[PDB]
Amino acid sequence: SHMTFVALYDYESRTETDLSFKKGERLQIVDWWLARSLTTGETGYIPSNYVAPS
Numbered sequence: 001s002h003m004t005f006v007a008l009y010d011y012e013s014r015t016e017t018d019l020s021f022k023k024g025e026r027l028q029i030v031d032w033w034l035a036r037s038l039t040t041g042e043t044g045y046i047p048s049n050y051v052a053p054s
């Protein structure tokens, strides 16, 4: 119930395994967490310090 987060900052993917996201984008969590964007539906790793509980 606690696994929805929101991006605090924009992030641009660096690698083939991380996920880009925009500030305010919500992420469902499945230092680096596997997440699914609730905007794009894409799944990848995000830096956990860039998101906070939503």
Ligand SMILES: COC[C@H]1O[C@@H]2O[C@H]3[C@H](O)[C@@H](OC)[C@@H](O[C@H]4[C@H](O)[C@@H](O)[C@@H](O[C@H]5[C@H](O)[C@@H](O)[C@@H](O[C@H]6[C@H](OC)[C@@H](O)[C@@H](O[C@H]7[C@H](OC)[C@@H](OC)[C@@H](O[C@H]8[C@H](O)[C@@H](OC)[C@@H](O[C@H]1[C@H](O)[C@H]2OC)O[C@@H]8CO)O[C@@H]7CO)O[C@@H]6CO)O[C@@H]5CO)O[C@@H]4CO)O[C@@H]3CO
Pocket (backbone or CB within 6 Å): 038, 039, 040, 041, 042
């Ligand atoms: C037009 O479709 C009719 C569809 O309408 C209703 O769905 C709503 C949905 O309820 C609503 O959600 C609140 C919103 O959807 C948004 C998603 O919630 C959000 O996650 C995001 O979606 C992402 C996906 O997460 C990504 O996965 C990706 O999707 C693309 C697929 O990549 C996996 C790609 O393959 C392709 O999808 C095809 C699909 O193959 C997987 C194909 O299935 C045969 C076909 O889908 C049919 C579907 O079978 C059928 O189901 C009964 C029906 O679906 C309706 C929902 O039932 C209804 O629910 C209320 O029609 C579909 C279309 O014919 O076609 C798919 C499209 O080609 O393409 C995917 C799109 O890129 O990327 C998306 C977008 O980021 O964003 C969603 C909204 O943009 O809206 C939905 C309707 O648009």
Ligand SMILES: [Cu+2]
Pocket (backbone or CB within 6 Å): 001, 002, 003
């Ligand atoms: Cu929870």
